Design a binder for this molecule. Sequence first.
Ligand SMILES: CC(=O)N[C@@H]1[C@@H](O)[C@H](O[C@@H]2O[C@H](CO[C@H]3O[C@H](CO)[C@@H](O)[C@H](O)[C@@H]3O[C@@H]3O[C@H](CO)[C@@H](O[C@@H]4O[C@H](CO)[C@H](O)[C@H](O)[C@H]4O)[C@H](O)[C@H]3NC(C)=O)[C@@H](O)[C@H](O[C@H]3O[C@H](CO)[C@@H](O)[C@H](O)[C@@H]3O[C@@H]3O[C@H](CO)[C@@H](O[C@@H]4O[C@H](CO)[C@H](O)[C@H](O)[C@H]4O)[C@H](O)[C@H]3NC(C)=O)[C@@H]2O)[C@@H](CO)O[C@H]1O
Lengths: 134, 134
Amino acid sequence: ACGLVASNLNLKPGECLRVRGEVAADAKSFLLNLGKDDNNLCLHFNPRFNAHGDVNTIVCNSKDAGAWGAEQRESAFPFQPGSVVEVCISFNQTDLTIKLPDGYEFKFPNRLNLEAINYLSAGGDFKIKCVAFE
Amino acid sequence: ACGLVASNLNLKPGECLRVRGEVAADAKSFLLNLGKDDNNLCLHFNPRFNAHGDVNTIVCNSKDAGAWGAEQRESAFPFQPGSVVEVCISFNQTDLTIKLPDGYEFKFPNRLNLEAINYLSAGGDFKIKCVAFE
Ligand SMILES: CC(=O)N[C@@H]1[C@@H](O)[C@H](O[C@@H]2O[C@H](CO[C@H]3O[C@H](CO)[C@@H](O)[C@H](O)[C@@H]3O[C@@H]3O[C@H](CO)[C@@H](O[C@@H]4O[C@H](CO)[C@H](O)[C@H](O)[C@H]4O)[C@H](O)[C@H]3NC(C)=O)[C@@H](O)[C@H](O[C@H]3O[C@H](CO)[C@@H](O)[C@H](O)[C@@H]3O[C@@H]3O[C@H](CO)[C@@H](O[C@@H]4O[C@H](CO)[C@H](O)[C@H](O)[C@H]4O)[C@H](O)[C@H]3NC(C)=O)[C@@H]2O)[C@@H](CO)O[C@H]1O
């Protein structure tokens, strides 16, 4: 299940990517990919309601030239199926900072050392309703 | 025009595409492209401040299999350079409603009889700040 694919983003460090969308009722999981292209992502944000063995766990990873990196799992899961959830990702060369709906923040290392995000992609059981550049 | 490019969308009749952006200070024109891909556009929204022999005129057109169609010029030009504009677009199989700021809104025929818009792209002296699928 793949949703929108966005290119020519040119989100530079300091800028904030605000993505709001609707989680499906039968939501197994959903994801957001940020990087330069599909085979090179600095952030594979993947909330797992019940998927790939994870129950209510956020799986984050990088992808370098097609190879997934080491996964980082977050136990904070403020998501409910069928709800409209907003997420906010601030870019930075050192790392990425994610703002969940409740105001919970956590970092993810910027492994590819990307100085600019140009690719965005959505997937899973989610419907992007808004993308805001700040 | 090459700015933001969002594909694999599935904007169907009933939803509203809301785009908000910043028009440059030295703005000659900007554009929003809607269709299946770059060679099949149901709408080419090209507000022109001073470009292609057009002074403050909105040029709309379609592109079928790479070939441009007949151009439609509008009566109102509710834009100023160095300002933030927001256009709303209602999708219908026979027409497209483009609701602009200041209460102006026109209709452009859906010459391709498109039942879903899978491609959006921006260009010109426009800076996408927000895009919504409501
Ligand atoms: C609604 C209406 O009536 N509007 C008109 C405007 O159209 C008009 O603009 C002038 O248009 C003249 C050309 O005619 C246009 O229309 C016909 C058909 O109607 C077309 O055949 C022609 O191509 C023009 O149409 C426009 O084409 C472009 C490109 O396809 C369209 O843009 C595209 O649109 C699609 C969307 O569908 C998409 O968005 C694309 O991205 C976009 O690019 C556009 O929409 C379309 N418009 C229309 C209404 O169809 C031009 O002659 C005139 O331009 C001259 O003058 C300006 C400055 O004022 C110059 O910037 C420009 O370069 C050009 O200069 C002239 O160049 C020629 C060639 O170099 C010179 O002649 C040469 O001179 C030599 C000697 O030195 C030799 O003699 C040689 O033989 C000779 O060829 C010429 O001297 C130059 N003139 C000058 C002054 O330098 C302008 O665009 C305006 C203004 O009149 O009036 C409105 O009423």
